[PDB]
């Protein structure tokens, strides 16, 4: 887990294969075992003595033959051209002499071949280790077979012995065979500037301004002197939201199934190369030995990408314009940047081999510099290779961008630079591109709904043939675009799943980044304004400088707001791409209808609530264009159902309800008050006989709950009046005076239920009179208000042991009336004081 | 001193070496987060004290040209970031406050001659969920502990004890006590739950720029408050990051999952229930199974109580008013 994603895990690394030759299987071919999350290595069940038959042997092999292979850095240090005057001190007297001795010394490398390899391969000292008195002890029980099969007995088996261990990598040049036949075709220190590049991850408010830190390194560049251009001669279409790129396209393990890989990105030219040496078909050998040689290859590949984008958008995705091609070019440029910096969040067959070869290139060339593994300075060599690659891309990007523009065409009159989009995390760039696609398709699907389905010439008019022919069919096209899974009407973008599902995955990932990037330890400069803030590093060089990595970007992206993809997207999107209906990404429309048709949350159309009235709440990804909930699917909303979006008087109660509903009933047995969101159990099994009836107890509880809640509610909307005071042509024609006229209706229902309940005590108190059992509304409401006092002004109602407040009584009788059996009015007056606005009347002034 | 008195409130009431300690530590976490929000200006309460404290803190950290956003940022990074320099380690104001909390707990534990709990030993305290969400978790935890308390009371006292209810722990007059406690505690909790759920439904998955108040709730993705609390109350309370648990609440005495939809049709929408915590609506409307066993006699004895207590109220109004009638 310490290793970063680019660190190229298990580096057993032949081109999508190895010493146990395989095809594309998984990211053992060729990186990131920590995310692979299984153990892909068996060098460990390699027994510890076979891992000393590796540690003595293969560890020798790699690191110490590397001491004479690659830590024998090269023989390029002759230093012949230039004469030297002063040196200050001489330390390399033994360096080169013991470097040539370092393969000719009888006392360090012949006393590392026929003395130390007497412990490795030519074992003269511990000859083919036989028995140890001052030598290795083995635990033979699992390593005994090695003695016979390698040391001092028969040694003939499959590649089960040799071939998988690194065997011949050290100048093995046996030439005992001659081949006369020809199987050949036709023959054939550093500078370090730092900057403050102003990213514009926006066009709108953006509380604070962005400024990322990048490291130019002019010594890593061509030399100078811009534009020059002439050379030539160098179809997917499905966002692959899939993942773990098993071996085909897809997203890294950590972004798997989470953001979707644009077809443009999976089709870009560089990503379709397993080499940079393959950049030109004509040339068939290594080409990159200098910084300018390496740069020219990137120039070629960028130019060819520009050529491809021209061949694709103008005019096959472009309408003779330039904005579309320009946006695609910007995105491809940023993807090139990520792909060479190694921070890309996607994969295919050629990536993870391109990255290997790219590490080798950025290795040799430019490598020298990098070395300050511990560092100490900051002009200084780039600490780790990855930062060196980042600096190489932060410089040298000008040349790539101009190459891209040349590859397209523009270059003077159709270009009129360096867009800063390459400084935005690839996740956010993918999110923006995917959303722009969705908004394009949505705009297409909404144009015709707006033209047709506005009631007759506006969304609100006579319903007379709302569907002038079938405008509901246009609304249904829009529904099948939003809800279906790509085959029954769904568009390009999502891959087999509804937009709601894909958006949910995007939100999960975005918030994952937000939480991680500031519950972090190391990040960039803040301007504290947000939630999940505890990490050690929030760094900078100058004032207000973010550290340019993903967490720092999500630190500056948070902390100005933008904690959710909705808000970030409303900030960055152009203006009006979402469609003719002015649907903002920040508003949340909770739509609810027949379960998403093709891929199903546990049903289609009959199992649950979501089956037929599907509750899901995205931004205006909604199944109607943000205002045509009623314009589609005809006649305009009634005054009553304009409460359900005005939403100051919500839906909890039904039959006896501040809350706009009912269930009946109209008989003796048994009209009842129902709560919305819970179902009364009409089972009379709850009860017993000859007492309060089975339905009577559930009624009494529902009624007393109604009483208390609706009294609280009417006080909230009357004294507070939801604002004071008091409280269309106002808010008090619709949504008010609309439930007041409901309360009367359903206090009447509740008055009917309770006078008829005392009449079910003509069914129950004729059994139990006169306790009257249950007491009438007057007396019960009296008791209810008195309990309301005794409970929360008298330290728990059970303090009713002593009732006297001794001067509260005047207030209490004023609020609650005297002489109980008079408590009908304690509620009726609150309805006769459900007035003074409706009343209304006049009003006074 | 707040931590000291808070520990004194929780721990000596029940000597469970973990349960009391873990509950006290969760309460102290909540109090510390509330203190942090008072400093940062995010607090939802402007009472007689915090209103003036908030205004004058705006004065202290403000200036002539500083707007509200700048002032809030100044308070936030004065608290969170190490705006204090000391001869000791790089302690930030948050760390100093938490260390003070720990010292108060140590004082209380020393006085009781107990052992300093392992929780409260954590040096770094995680992020604070938004104040409303923290209060929602507190409400749920308190509701569930008091629900188990009151329902076990009514179970073993009013509705038939293990000893033939007619000859049970009730003479039909103290069973009234248990049912009274349950019904009276339940009633306000229903209104409170309705209010909190209605606020959650308009607050979840909102950034700073979208939420009605300036604070962000991006971290809370859950369609309904019940689903959120299902994710949250899923575990057993420990002291860190899980300050609530809900066992056997609502209707049945098992945990997640008693009946999964994995075997019929994916998925199971809880998630995860801790009792089909949709039962929160049923339990607050007294439609759960557990109460339905007790519904009958609870209601009838409630009516008897209403009748007699009303025969008392009618003669007490006339008692102490003494102007209208008898007594």
């Amino acid at each position: 887990c310490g290793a970063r994603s680019n660190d190229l895990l298990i580096k057993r690394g032949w081109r999508t294969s190895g010493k146990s030759d395989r095809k594309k299987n998984f990211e053992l071919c060729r990186k990131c075992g920590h995310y692979e999350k299984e153990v892909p290595t068996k060098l460990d069940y390699v027994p510890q003595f076979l891992r000393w038959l590796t540690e003595w042997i293969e560890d020798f092999y790699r690191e110490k033959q590397n001491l004479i292979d690659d830590m024998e850095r090269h023989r390029e240090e002759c230093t012949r051209e230039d004469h030297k005057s002063k040196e200050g001190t001489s330390y390399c007297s033994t360096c080169k002499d013991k470097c040539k001795k370092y393969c000719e010394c009888v006392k360090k490398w012949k006393t590392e071949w026929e003395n130390q390899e007497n412990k490795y391969k030519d074992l003269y000292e511990q000859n083919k280790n036989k028995t140890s008195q001052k030598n290795t002890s083995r635990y033979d029980d699992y390593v005994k077979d090695f003695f016979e099969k390698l040391e001092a007995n028969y040694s003939s088996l499959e590649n089960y012995i040799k071939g998988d261990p690194y065997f011949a990598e050290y100048a093995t040049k046996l030439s005992f065979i001659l081949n006369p036949s020809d199987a050949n075709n036709p023959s054939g220190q550093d500078l370090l500037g730092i900057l403050q590049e102003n990213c514009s991850d926006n066009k709108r408010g953006s509380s604070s301004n962005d400024s990322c830190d990048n490291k130019n390194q002019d010594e890593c560049q061509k030399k100078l002197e811009k534009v020059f251009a002439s050379l030539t001669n160098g179809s997917k279409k499905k966002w692959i939201w899939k993942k773990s790129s098993g071996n085909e396209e897809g997203l890294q393990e950590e972004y798997a199934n989470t953001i979707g890989l644009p077809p443009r990105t999976q089709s870009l030219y560089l990503g379709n190369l397993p080499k940079l040496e393959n950049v030109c078909e004509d040339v068939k050998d290594i080409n990159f030995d200098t910084k300018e040689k390496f740069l020219a290859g990137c120039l070629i590949v960028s130019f060819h990408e520009g050529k491809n984008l021209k061949k694709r958008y103008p005019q096959n995705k472009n309408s003779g314009n330039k904005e579309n091609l320009c946006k695609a070019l910007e995105y491809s440029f940023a993807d090139y940047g990520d792909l060479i910096k190694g921070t890309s969040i996607w994969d295919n067959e050629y990536t993870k081999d391109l990255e290997l070869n790219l590490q080798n290139n950025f290795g040799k060339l430019f490598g020298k510099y990098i070395k300050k593994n511990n560092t100490a300075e900051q002009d200084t060599s780039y600490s780790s290779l990855d930062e060196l690659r980042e600096s190489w891309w932060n410089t040298n990007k000008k040349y790539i961008w101009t190459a891209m523009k040349h590859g397209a065409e523009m270059n003077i009159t159709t270009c009129n630079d360096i867009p800063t989009i390459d400084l935005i995390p690839q996740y956010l760039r993918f999110l923006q591109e995917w959303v722009e696609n969705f908004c394009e398709q949505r705009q297409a699907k909404v144009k015709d709904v707006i033209t047709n389905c506005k009631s007759c010439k506006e969304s609100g008019n006579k319903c007379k043939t709302e569907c002038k022919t079938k405008c509901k069919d246009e609304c249904e096209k829009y529904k099948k675009f939003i809800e279906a899974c790509g085959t029954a009407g769904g568009g390009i973008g999502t891959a087999g799943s509804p937009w709601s599902k894909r958006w949910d995955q995007i939100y999960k990932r975005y918030s994952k980044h937000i939480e991680d990037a500031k519950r972090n330890r190391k990040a960039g400069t803040k301007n504290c304004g947000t939630s999940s803030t505890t990490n050690a590093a929030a760094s900078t060089d100058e004032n207000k400088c973010v550290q340019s990595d993903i967490d720092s970007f999500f630190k500056h992206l948070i902390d100005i707001g933008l904690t959710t993809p909705s808000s970030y997207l409303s900030n960055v999107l152009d203006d009006n791409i979402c469609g003719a209906d002015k649907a903002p990404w920040t508003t949340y429309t909770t739509y609810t209808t027949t379960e998403k048709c093709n891929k199903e949350r546990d049903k289609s159309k009959s199992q649950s609530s979501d089956t037929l009235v599907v509750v899901n709440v995205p931004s205006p990804l909604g199944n109607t264009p943000y205002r045509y909930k009623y314009a589609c699917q005809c006649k305009i909303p009634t005054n009553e159902e304009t409460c359900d979006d005005r939403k100051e008087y919500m839906n909890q109660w039904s039959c006896g309800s501040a809350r706009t509903m009912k269930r009946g009933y109209k008989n003796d047995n048994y009209e009842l008050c129902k709560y919305n969101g819970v179902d009364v159990k009409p089972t009379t099994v709850r009860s017993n006989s000859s007492k309060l009836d089975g339905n009577d107890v559930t009624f009494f509880n529902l009624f007393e709950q109604w009483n208390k809640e609706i009294q609280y509610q009417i006080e909230q909307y009357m004294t507070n009046a939801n604002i004071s005071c008091i409280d269309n042509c106002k808010e008090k024609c619709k949504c008010y005076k609309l439930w007041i006229e409901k309360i009367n209706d359903q206090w009447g229902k509740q008055k009917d239920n309770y006078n008829k309940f005392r009449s079910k005590q003509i069914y129950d108190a004729n059994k139990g009179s006169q306790n009257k059992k249950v007491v009438s509304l007057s007396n019960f409401l009296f008791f209810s208000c008195w309990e309301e006092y005794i409970q929360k002004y008298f330290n728990g109602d059970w303090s009713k042991i002593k009732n006297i407040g001794s001067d509260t009584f005047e207030f209490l009788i004023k609020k609650c009336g005297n002489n109980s059996a008079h408590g009908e009015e304690i509620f009726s007056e609150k309805l006769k004081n459900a007035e003074k606005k409706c009343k209304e009347n006049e009003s006074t002034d | 001193r707040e931590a000291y008195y808070l520990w004194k409130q929780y721990n000596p009431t029940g000597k469970g070496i973990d349960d009391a300690n873990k509950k006290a530590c969760c309460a102290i976490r909540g109090s510390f987060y509330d203190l942090e929000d008072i400093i940062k200006g995010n607090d939802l309460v402007h009472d007689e004290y915090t209103k003036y404290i908030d205004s004058k803190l705006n004065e202290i950290f403000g200036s002539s040209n500083t707007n509200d956003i700048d002032t809030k940022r100044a308070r936030t990074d004065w608290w969170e970031n190490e705006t204090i320099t000391n001869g000791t380690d790089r302690k930030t104001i948050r760390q100093l406050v938490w260390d003070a909390m720990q010292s108060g707990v140590r004082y209380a534990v020393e006085e009781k001659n107990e052992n300093f709990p392992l929780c409260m030993g954590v040096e770094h305290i995680g992020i604070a969920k938004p104040q409303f969400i923290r209060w929602l978790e507190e409400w749920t935890n308190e509701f569930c502990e008091k629900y188990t308390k009151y329902f076990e009371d009514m179970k073993s006292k009013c509705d038939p004890p293990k000893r033939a209810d007619t000859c049970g722990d009730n003479s039909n007059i103290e069973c009234k006590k248990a049912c009274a406690n349950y019904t009276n505690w339940l009633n306000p909790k229903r209104i409170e739950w309705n209010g909190m759920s209605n606020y959650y439904n308009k607050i979840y998955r909102k950034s700073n720029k979208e939420s009605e108040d300036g604070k962000d709730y991006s971290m809370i993705m859950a369609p309904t408050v019940i689903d959120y609390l299902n994710k949250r109350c899923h575990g057993e309370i420990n002291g860190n990051y899980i300050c609530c648990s809900c066992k056997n609440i609502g209707a049945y005495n098992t945990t997640s999952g008693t009946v999964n939809k994995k075997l019929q049709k994916k998925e199971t929408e809880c998630e995860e229930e801790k009792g089909p915590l949709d039962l929160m609506n049923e339990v607050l409307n007294k439609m759960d199974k557990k109460y339905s066993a007790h519904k009958m006699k609870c209601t009838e004895v409630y009516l008897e109580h209403v009748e007699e207590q009303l025969n008392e109220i009618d003669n007490a109004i006339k008692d102490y008013k003494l102007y209208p009638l008898d007594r």
């Epitope: 514009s200 066009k203 953006s206 409303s570 152009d574 203006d575 | 700073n208």
Partner: antibody, heavy 122, light 107 residues
Amino acid sequence: VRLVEYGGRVVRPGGSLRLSCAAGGFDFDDYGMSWVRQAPGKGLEWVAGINWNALDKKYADSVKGRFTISRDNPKSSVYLQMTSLTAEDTALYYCARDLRNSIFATGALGNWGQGTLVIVSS
Amino acid sequence: IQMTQSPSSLSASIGDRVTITCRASQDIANYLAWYQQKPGTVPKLLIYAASTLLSGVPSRFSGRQSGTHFTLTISSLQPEDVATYYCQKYNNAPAAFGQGTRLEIKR
């Protein structure tokens, strides 16, 4: 759909004045508002803008510090408090709404009020 | 942020094509709206998003954009189109209006 302003008055130079703007069938709770002034026989000039939740208030560079904008959603009003008025602030002041509900102070002003004269002189 | 609108007194006759330019100093990519004001009335928003014609506006208006050059085009000038046009940008901070172009009948 219906915006009316109040407070148009003749004020002494350097004085103060509070303009108000109502709202009609318009759902004045998630739409940004703006104040735009037009001096007599001149071009319009943006003056102030306030977000939907009043967490984002922006001002023109000239009228900054001297002008304050505020909402009151339950009363469905938006107010502009003006102080240190100069002789140059004499203008017809309109209150306008975004035509798009959003999270920003500034936007396309779709519906405008009749405006109030704020003649400033001695 | 300034919004240089020119010409300031464009003249034309009924039936002509009228073009108004609203150069923006910074990048506002398409957060620009066009306003028409007849004498003695409130302004009326014609175009927003720099191209999207507002509903009810006669279709003879159009708006297009090239970089930071925004142009409002009246294809067939009508006697009820004689007014001032303002091209207010609304991207972020000062949302400032244009200078104002006043059309007049050419005789």
